[PDB]
Amino acid sequence: SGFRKMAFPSGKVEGCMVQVTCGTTTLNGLWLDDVVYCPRHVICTSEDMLNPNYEDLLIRKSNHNFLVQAGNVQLRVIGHSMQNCVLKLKVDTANPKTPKYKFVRIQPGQTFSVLACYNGSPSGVYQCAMRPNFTIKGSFLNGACGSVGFNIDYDCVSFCYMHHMELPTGVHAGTDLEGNFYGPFVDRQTAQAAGTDTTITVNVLAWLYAAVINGDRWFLNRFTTTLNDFNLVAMKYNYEPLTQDHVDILGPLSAQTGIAVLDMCASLKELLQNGMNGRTILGSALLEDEFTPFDVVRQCSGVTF
Amino acid sequence: SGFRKMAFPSGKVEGCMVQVTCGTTTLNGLWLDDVVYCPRHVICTSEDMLNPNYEDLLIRKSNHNFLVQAGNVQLRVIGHSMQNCVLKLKVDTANPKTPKYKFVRIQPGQTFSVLACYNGSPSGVYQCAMRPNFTIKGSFLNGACGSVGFNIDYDCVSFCYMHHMELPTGVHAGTDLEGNFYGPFVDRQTAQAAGTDTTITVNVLAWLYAAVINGDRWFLNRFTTTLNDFNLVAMKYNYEPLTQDHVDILGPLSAQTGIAVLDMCASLKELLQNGMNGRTILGSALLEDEFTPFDVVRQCSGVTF
Ligand SMILES: *C(=N)[C@H](C[C@@H]1CCNC1=O)NC(=O)[C@@H]1[C@@H]2[C@H](CN1C(=O)[C@@H](NC(=O)C(F)(F)F)C(C)(C)C)C2(C)C
Ligand SMILES: *C(=N)[C@H](C[C@@H]1CCNC1=O)NC(=O)[C@@H]1[C@@H]2[C@H](CN1C(=O)[C@@H](NC(=O)C(F)(F)F)C(C)(C)C)C2(C)C
Ligand SMILES: [Cl-]
């Protein structure tokens, strides 16, 4: 029993982290086979980053201008291209610790682990949701850029995030590993704000199922609702619409606990209308939306890698 | 910016995890050099665990009775002893992935990362506090026993916890790596409950400093208090006494923010007496006590391993 915010084990990703230095800018890179992927703004100075021309700054760099270090071993760059907002540095050495991997673009609502790195050295690991406004609620200092987010499925690491920047209110924005931003953000230092966020309804339901499984049951009411009736009340409290795909994805938790998704919807509608009256669920005084149905099943049925 | 529950990177510990099978019982072991450490109740059946005689059950085991697997490689046991509640199995192979390590017994109030493992395979990593009642608030299913808790200091893994059991209310109990229980718990299936818990005052203060650093400042009042006056109000809300050692440990955060520890004490006393009036701190509607002063500095100043 017990329910925790739980990251994937980071060992497979730790063996891929390197330091990339260009001019005086240092940040993190991801070394897979004979390629190092990092944020393209490594080729900028302070001045540059207000409104940089990246294609221009890159024309003017040799292979030798990029210093890539894995521990106190220097990798020799033998090639450099740009793909959207990501730099690819071909190196003379294939990373012998390359795991089985894929590059994935996740949807809003999906969780992943961040390995927070400084100078190519891992600082910590924590779990994050891609918010509907295409931000994450991370913990990143100066030098954290090139830190990656990932999922693990048995042996395969799916990389879905690379860290680029911090927005007002200390939320974070970044790219897939093909260098395309999540959301409408750009890699320059200008006025950018997140759209207002919404609550990921399917994740709150997944969390309510985790509470039931762990014996926290006080909020269960004796009522049902229609999907339509639920989605009208959800809308007022800035909750995402719940789709039929969402209902089908909650099937396993529903079948495990014997509570129909629309019965849990009735329970959530009451918590939204009446609040929690100073009571907690799984130790929390707020409804939690950063656990997916898959994360609840993992943790509550003990899936390993 | 941002403040997250953040685990240590688990790679160094992942390379030490093995599966231990004795009879039909399987659980996790920690393989360091040529020794595998696991919970001694691996030598029990269901029946045994109500009131087992461990010295007796062990007399009757050969080296060959212990099946130790690291992936799909079997390690040959060549020696077996018991140290308190932990089994030591000498094996024929030194673990080539053994990190620099120490065995440490932590004090109540201290945090660590748990690597939750099933069948010798890592499931997830999360951060935990040793509670004043000598429990942790973990997430452990059947087969999680032998899962370890650790801290990392640059290159050195300090192992401080091995998981043994779950107590009523789904809190967890275990040993140091010398096999001595934290708290008054025993490794048998009987009536055992945790003492009532208390709030780790020094950790709540560390967290309030993290809030200030992240720009969450609404709860700062214009008042000071005496240590004596603070500890009287703390006592009513089931908060630990704050000692002078606690004040000295908070010095760095105090000097960084320019708020005297006794000024933050005045701010916490007001939150305890008046509550939060429906406001949040670092996203939380409850005061958090599972970040140490060291954890706050790590995260807010970017320490790596
Ligand atoms: C890479 N190491 C940093 C990581 C940042 C620094 C503070 N915390 C983080 O997560 N990335 C940057 O410094 C990027 C970089 C230029 C500006 N920048 C920002 O994150 C800035 N943000 C913005 O300009 C805004 F508002 F658009 F989000 C900053 C003001 C420094 C927080 C580039 C190329 C985007
Ligand atoms: C080892 N894999 C398990 C881990 C447990 C199982 C459920 N979640 C966990 O964290 N350890 C045990 O099964 C230990 C084991 C016998 C009983 N046990 C317990 O944790 C039991 N607890 C207690 O008897 C009590 F109340 F004292 F805590 C159980 C009722 C199964 C939860 C031994 C040797 C202690
Ligand atoms: Cl909360």
Curated annotation (Swiss-Prot), chains A, B:
<feature type="domain" description="Peptidase C30">
    <location>
        <begin position="1"/>
        <end position="305"/>
    </location>
</feature>
<feature type="active site" description="Nucleophile; for 3CL-PRO activity">
    <location>
        <position position="145"/>
    </location>
</feature>
<feature type="active site" description="For 3CL-PRO activity">
    <location>
        <position position="41"/>
    </location>
</feature>
<comment type="subunit">
    <text>3CL-PRO exists as monomer and homodimer. Only the homodimer shows catalytic activity. Interacts with host FBXO22; this interaction promotes the proteasomal degradation of nsp5.</text>
</comment>
<feature type="cross-link" description="Glycyl lysine isopeptide (Lys-Gly) (interchain with G-Cter in ubiquitin)">
    <location>
        <position position="5"/>
    </location>
</feature>
<feature type="cross-link" description="Glycyl lysine isopeptide (Lys-Gly) (interchain with G-Cter in ubiquitin)">
    <location>
        <position position="90"/>
    </location>
</feature>
<comment type="function">
    <text>Cleaves the C-terminus of replicase polyprotein at 11 sites. Recognizes substrates containing the core sequence [ILMVF]-Q-|-[SGACN]. Cleaves and inactivates human TRMT1, preventing tRNA guanine(26)-dimethylation of tRNAs. May cleave human NLRP1 in lung epithelial cells, thereby activating the NLRP1 inflammasome pathway. May cleave human GSDMD, triggering alternative GSDME-mediated epithelial cell death upon activation of the NLRP1 inflammasome, which may enhance the release interleukins 1B, 6, 16 and 18. Also able to bind an ADP-ribose-1''-phosphate (ADRP).</text>
</comment>
<feature type="topological domain" description="Cytoplasmic">
    <location>
        <begin position="1"/>
        <end position="305"/>
    </location>
</feature>
<protein>
    <recommendedName>
        <fullName>3C-like proteinase nsp5</fullName>
    </recommendedName>
</protein>
